[model samples]
Target: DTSGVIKMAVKADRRAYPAQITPKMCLLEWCRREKLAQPVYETVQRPLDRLFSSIVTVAEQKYQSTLWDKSKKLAEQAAAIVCLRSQGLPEGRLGEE
Candidate 1:
């Protein structure tokens, strides 16, 4: 809603399996633990390719997705996913350990 947050269909009560990775959740938790600011997300849509991607800024660093997605939702996660990966984390679906 506000404050650059997204609704993730993830199981917050349980730990995630290797295949069950959530970029948004992982990114938020990483920020909280690192005492970094919350990620600020910005969606980008290219006119030439008609593709979407997202840019996220946090901890005085900026991360953008080279992989463009079809939708804004996936694009936001796309940024977070890469950001997490750079921080040594994984990405994908979320739920059920």
Candidate 2:
């Protein structure tokens, strides 16, 4: 029943933020179960998409970079930071917080 909403959320987030992909399962479920207004979801959708697009682009680029001697480690690190940001963590500390 709610699978469609779940898929839309996942698809939208991934399309906008490839690297900093936020998990939308919980949010989607909440919205579905709560019968939240459509506008509620729409309100958050575009901004998040835009913000993450820019943020994730940088992270994706860093993750895809081949110049680093420790390319794998670098990619992993970039992904970790992106995940943190997506999870609502403070961006002030990219290393330790």
Candidate 3:
């Protein structure tokens, strides 16, 4: 499915860049359906899991600079709301804690 491809894409991106991954990919939708994003995001954010944390950080960093910019703008315009201002993104567009 599209979600599976998204997951693979994220993982591949993580391998290439150090904090450039974001959770907005289709895989995130799948995770929401499966109720798995919270735990997975938490695990990657944990200090103890240093390796995973590094990779996730890289992935998210890339996402913000590349993928999220346009999408976030469009989403806010479509919703007629200042989405980013209202949602309270983390210091670095990180997943919610």
Candidate 4:
């Protein structure tokens, strides 16, 4: 009660198919594996490689260059989602933050 939030319902150990694809989990795992690359702007080759590591990890060791290309796009999307979820700002206004 002190926290000003309460749970109305609780579910335990449930499994369900995802309704849609999401890039957040991929981005987080990528960030963990590529701590060194995090400092580099995500545009650099090393960062791209780090992104590849993340994508492959999430995709269960299966990967392709086409998928690698997709990371850049997904990374941007992932970044925007993270920013919006964390900071309540839209992608277009992100650079100002």
Candidate 5:
């Protein structure tokens, strides 16, 4: 059960933006379980619109999302979603909590 594992794992880390178990948390839990390097997120002030663009570095590559937002946290979640999807993990929000 993917949800069982990630939900249990991230539950203890404990934060609430609730309505769902957002993507970035799921990404972190999966990496630790898989013994992969932790994802590091960075927000870039985009040259185009000067908006925040998120990037997550994992698996020795940078994963980015086109979505930009006022909150870097949301940007990071978008980045995490893309990264998880690329690894065939369905971005961990398929059913959403």
Candidate 6:
């Protein structure tokens, strides 16, 4: 159910904005907003966190704007997904499931 909500939020945001709202952007904002730390057991989490951080950093530097405005819809969707994940929902189908 949580995964479903995440999927829906991402989809809706993408549709509403339809510009520069990439999955990576969404994930990066999500990780940061949730204050997620490097996972000890979930190996995927660490790599994903690092990767998303890198992507967001590069995008921000290149665009010279906050990711939230540059990609508002994605940022919102990311927040939603990250919130659910932080609450203990496992990662499910994300981005073009």
Best by lDDT: 1
> Across residues 1-97, which tens digit of lDDT does each residue of candidate 6 receive?
2122221222224544545444444544445555754211111123434322111122122111112323434444454344444445433333453
Model 2, global lDDT? 0.28
lDDT score, candidate 2, position 9: 16
Q: For residues 68-97, write the lDDT of model 4, one tens digit per residue.
A: 323454544433244223333332221212
lDDT string, candidate 2, 1-97, tens digits: 2221211011121224554433233333333444743112111113433322111222122211111222333333333334333445442322222
Backbone clashes under 3 angstroms, per model: 0, 0, 13, 0, 0, 0
Screening candidate 1 with a backbone cut-off below 3 angstroms (N, C-alpha, C), the clashing residue pairs are none
Off by over 4 Å in 6: 1-69, 91-97
TM-score of 5: 0.67
lDDT of 6 at 37: 41
Which ranges in model 2 have alpha carbons more than 4 Å from their true place? 1-70, 91-97
Residues 25-65, model 1: lDDT tens digits: 77887787789889899887886887787778877667776
lDDT of each: 0.66, 0.28, 0.26, 0.31, 0.63, 0.33
TM-score of 2: 0.23
- Listed in order, each prediction's TM-score against the native is 0.66, 0.23, 0.19, 0.25, 0.67, 0.24
Per-residue CA lDDT of candidate 5, range 28-80, in tens?
Answer: 88887779889988778765775676767776667776556666666777677
Cand. 4 Cα-lDDT: 0.31
- C-alpha displacement of 79 in model 4, angstroms? 0.8
TM-score of 6: 0.24
Give the poorly placed runs of model 5, Cα more than 4 Å off.
1-19, 47-50, 93-97
Candidate 4 wrongly placed segments (more than 4 Å)? 1-44, 47-70, 88-97
